Design a protein around this nucleic acid. Structure first.
Ligand SMILES: [Zn+2]
Ligand SMILES: [Zn+2]
Ligand SMILES: [Zn+2]
Ligand SMILES: [Zn+2]
Lengths: 76, 78
DNA sequence: CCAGAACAGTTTGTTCTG
DNA sequence: CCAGAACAAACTGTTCTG
């Protein structure tokens, strides 16, 4: 039918850092946790994270990753 | 003495399309108005437009541009 | 000076590799 | 199959031109 990324609703590529996600949320999460960016939502931590706008709010996209269960860790 | 962009609060470069802006807002405004995309704010049409985050929500940045008085035009003469 | 164009750096996303 | 690396397209911002 089609695997859907639990972060953004794009087509998922596989189970990454614990969660069914697309390729972009995969690198995103990795890059976000890794560098210290201190991302702050410019709205109210409310943002819809979807395919077209996922890059809009890194704070909300990262928060969604963390709530979906994504966890850092290199090749289990 | 430093001139402040009225859209994002960065340092302003001049008066562009009718208001005090930085060069990034200047082009953003023209690209946005001429592009094929009517941006949909993923929040509440409320977003803060400041230097670090101006890129975050093009819908709200464009809204802020238009509300500030920015208007498309060609190269006008005095 | 400022709009538009051209150029350039930054960012996000996709394909390659072990 | 999946992390991480290498690659690449897309997007945002800066310097050049009339
Ligand atoms: Zn995704
Ligand atoms: Zn947000
Ligand atoms: Zn600005
Ligand atoms: Zn917004």
């Amino acid at each position: 039918p089609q695997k859907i990324c639990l972060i953004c609703g794009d087509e998922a590529s596989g189970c990454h850092y614990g969660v069914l996600t697309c390729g972009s949320c995969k690198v995103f999460f990795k890059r976000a946790m890794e560098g210290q960016h201190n991302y702050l939502c410019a709205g109210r931590n409310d943002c819809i994270v979807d395919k077209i706008r996922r890059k809009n709010c890194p704070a909300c996209r990262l928060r969604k990753c963390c709530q979906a269960g994504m966890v850092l860790g290199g090749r289990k």
